[PDB]
Design a binder for these strands. Structure first.
Lengths: 197, 50, 310, 50
RNA sequence: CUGAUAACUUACAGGACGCUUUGGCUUCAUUGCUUUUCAGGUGAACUGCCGAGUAGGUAG
């Protein structure tokens, strides 16, 4: 019983991650005035490089789906024609069911991330005795990573520049009602919820 | 012995040209280098070969 | 002039700059780095080198040798320009001594110019020379940001005069030699970037590495650390900053070059007036206007020096 | 089973045979040859005209 | 508008039998390839939490 409003980026030359991140920031601004976790991300044109020009907001209700797509940002990028919002059409039966998963394992591979991890492990080694050597914690020599298309997100309450980094993968077309999260989802601590693309 | 075509510009003479060379050096923490060979002296000068 | 077969051999000989992580237990390990590759879904390697958590500081060690290859050419081919160049060197040596170039070369070794970027966002960095041949204590330069800023800060008479002389005698004497073993200590902020030398790879950020105790470590080049010591050339027409000594005064950061053959201040325009510079170095007085500053540049090129032939 | 630099068999033969200081004047020893060529000075001493 | 105008070469077939290329041999004396080299991330993908954990997750 899922509907979709795909917003395509028209202006012919633009960064897609810079828009996708902003779209998820405004989704994240919502779901706090209306404490809900119902709405997905649905990147339909996710290729290996430059995630495609449009993003939908697949959900069940279709009353919140269109509540959040009128929040004076999506509307303000409509008169100046950089967005093209759809008319909330239903998902067909036999679709491709993908899953956009925030990993967060990639954030703790960065040298800062490793340092942060070792510093925490140093703090909660208060199971006291040997002050374990930070000498015996070396980055291996080589890490083969894929694929994770990192989006330029940032914190509101603190002025910190983070980076949610998200992976596409497709199987098992049914679980939950819905589940999702703050920034849309296919991971958060409970679910591997698919998305009908 | 004058100047060339104006293709040798102030910009063109500042382009980095790469060479490939074999580099040999003493590795860090080594005591010293040992160089060994053999030499033999004989009487091949007493009599011509041909 | 330019006798179709003329080469010089370099008089300064630096080595690779080996990095060590020294720990709060004053034990030292070879600094190692991470090499990430993004396995693009159904070549582009990137390297990251930081100071590991809970490390005391970094130790950077290398050696440099000042020798006497600038007195006579390696190959010359011509028993006319050989004696011309040997006369020009010894007339320079007698009239305007090795003090200026010796000081300029030695300052870059004593202020950590050869660290390039690693001194940026650093608290304290000290340099210790072990000179040879030498009878006494190691030459020390403590935190080189506060109390070693200008020439006069170095001329603290404790050792400076004892190590400038021995570079003058290296360039003066036949089979002259001075060997400095340089060790720098870098007190960086927690988890700070180390910036070593990068491999060419003709077409992102592959580092130049060596093996120490069976683990790979970044090295910050050999010819790299020679380019740093030879950044003494600020005699080019007007002046802004010191360039690395070349023939056509090349700036790398912006891809122009000063000392362009049009200006008549490149090495080949100045060299082809050797016969002129012989007579002006005989009579009193040589001006420090363009003539001394050209002799400095000509010598600077001969302390360097490949093939000046056509 | 590892690649190592060599310094050469013929080059070490040239080093041992750098004794020829008998050529017309005399300054430094040459590689003993037929025409006693200097390698640094691209000229040949001991040339048949002499 | 042709040395013009027209034009059915056909039918059948057994190359076979035999064979020893051989002996002999010294390619050698001499040798210097070398000189000089900058690959380049202005800051930027952070701070926590859960977890026995260089495991695996987690908010903003």
């Amino acid at each position: 019983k899922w509907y979709y409003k795909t917003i395509t980026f028209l202006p012919e030359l633009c960064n897609n991650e810079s828009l996708a991140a902003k779209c998820l920031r405004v989704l994240h601004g919502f779901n706090y005035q209306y404490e809900t976790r119902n709405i997905g991300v649905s990147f339909p044109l996710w290729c290996d490089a430059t995630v495609g020009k449009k993003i939908s907001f697949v959900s069940k209700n279709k009353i919140e789906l269109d509540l959040l797509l009128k929040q004076h940002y999506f509307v303000q990028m409509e008169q100046l024609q950089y967005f093209h919002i759809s008319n909330t059409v239903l998902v067909p039966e036999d679709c491709t069911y993908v899953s956009f998963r925030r990993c967060q394992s990639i954030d703790k591979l960065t040298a800062a991330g490793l340092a942060r991890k070792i510093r925490r492990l140093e703090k909660r080694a208060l199971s006291r005795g040997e002050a374990f050597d930070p000498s015996s914690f070396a980055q291996k020599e080589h890490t083969a990573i894929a694929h994770y298309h990192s989006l330029g997100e940032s914190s509101k309450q603190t002025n910190r520049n983070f980076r949610l980094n998200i992976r596409m993968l497709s199987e098992q077309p049914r679980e939950g009602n819905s589940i999702f999260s703050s920034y849309g989802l296919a991971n958060s601590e409970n679910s591997f919820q698919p998305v009908p693309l | 012995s004058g100047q060339p075509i104006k293709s040798a510009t102030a910009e063109a003479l500042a382009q980095g040209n790469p060479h490939q060379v074999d580099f040999c050096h003493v590795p860090y923490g080594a005591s010293h280098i040992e160089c060994s060979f053999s030499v033999s002296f004989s009487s091949e000068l007493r009599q011509p070969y041909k | 002039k330019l006798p179709t077969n003329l080469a010089y051999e370099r008089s300064i000989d630096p080595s690779d700059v080996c990095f060590f992580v020294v720990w709060p237990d004053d034990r030292k390990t070879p600094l190692t780095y991470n090499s990430r590759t993004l396995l693009g879904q159904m070549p582009h390697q990137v390297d990251f080198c930081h100071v590991p958590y809970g490390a005391s500081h970094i130790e950077c060690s290398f050696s440099v040798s000042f020798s006497s290859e600038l007195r006579q050419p390696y190959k010359c081919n011509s028993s006319k320009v050989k004696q011309t160049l040997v006369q020009l060197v010894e007339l320079y040596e007698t009239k305007i001594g090795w003090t200026e170039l010796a000081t300029r070369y030695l300052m870059n070794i004593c202020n950590g110019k050869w660290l390039w970027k690693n001194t940026r966002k650093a608290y304290c960095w000290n340099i210790v020379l072990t000179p040879w041949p030498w009878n006494g204590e190691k030459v020390g330069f403590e935190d080189i940001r506060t109390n070693y800023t200008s020439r006069q800060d170095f001329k603290n008479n404790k050792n400076w005069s004892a190590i400038v002389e021995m570079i003058k005698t290296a360039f003066s004497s036949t089979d002259g030699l001075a060997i400095f073993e340089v060790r720098a200590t870098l007190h960086l902020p927690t988890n700070a970037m180390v910036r070593p030398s990068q491999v060419f790879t003709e077409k992102s950020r592959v580092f130049q590495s060596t093996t120490i105790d069976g683990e790979r470590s970044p090295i910050l080049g050999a010819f790299k650390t020679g380019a740093a010591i030879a950044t003494i050339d600020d005699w080019y027409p007007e002046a802004t900053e010191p360039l690395r000594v070349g023939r056509f005064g090349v700036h790398r950061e912006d891809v122009t070059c000063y000392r362009h053959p049009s200006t008549g201040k490149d090495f080949f325009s100045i060299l082809q007036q050797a016969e002129h510079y012989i007579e002006v170095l005989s009579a009193n007085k040589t001006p420090a206007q363009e003539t001394i500053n050209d002799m400095h540049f000509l010598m600077a090129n001969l302390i360097k020096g490949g093939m000046f032939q056509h």
